[model samples]
Target: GSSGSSGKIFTCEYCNKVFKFKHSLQAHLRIHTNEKPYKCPQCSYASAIKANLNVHLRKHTGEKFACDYCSFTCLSKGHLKVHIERVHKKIK
Candidate 1:
């Protein structure tokens, strides 16, 4: 969805990207922005989204998502199960 704004008012210094609205520009700015606005400062890691950053924080705390069978691991349990069923052929 393109916001109806004009001109190159915002510029990302990291990658030299540009955008219009401050919000859209803020999202786009993330690309070249390099700065992870969403971060778990306690863990010293950051993400563009809070949900993602939260998941990442789990890594440091040893909180993980594992496959019901075999030795598969993932950050997102939903994605991990999907992968196992789709790629491993172990699911009925």
Candidate 2:
């Protein structure tokens, strides 16, 4: 029995770089070590990765998660959950 493996190779035409797999090309490009190139001009929020920067921008947009029991506000849901479990264990 003969199995045919047809895989497409990708090459970066701009830099003439070649990679056997698409993931390899993505990993190789990180070698450039570029800092936070994208930033919010409205604020000083920035990040090395775009996804992180987007999360950070939410802070500037007044998007906050608050505890129902107390007036404690947090930037993320995880933090708010932790606060509730730790501080508001029993309420009268």
Task: List model 2 lDDT by residue over 16-74, tens digit each.
Answer: 79999999888766545544587776775556778887776766776689899998998
Best candidate, lDDT: 2
- Candidate 2 yields a Cα-based lDDT of 0.76
Report the alpha-carbon TM-score of model 1 versus the true structure: 0.33
TM-score of each: 0.33, 0.40
- Which residue pairs in model 1 clash with each other? none
Model 2 poorest ten-residue lDDT run = 27-36
List the RMSD of every prediction in angstroms: 7.8, 10.0
Backbone Cα, N, C clashes tallied per candidate:
0, 0
Best by TM-score: 2
RMSD of 2: 10.0
For candidate 2, what is the TM-score? 0.40
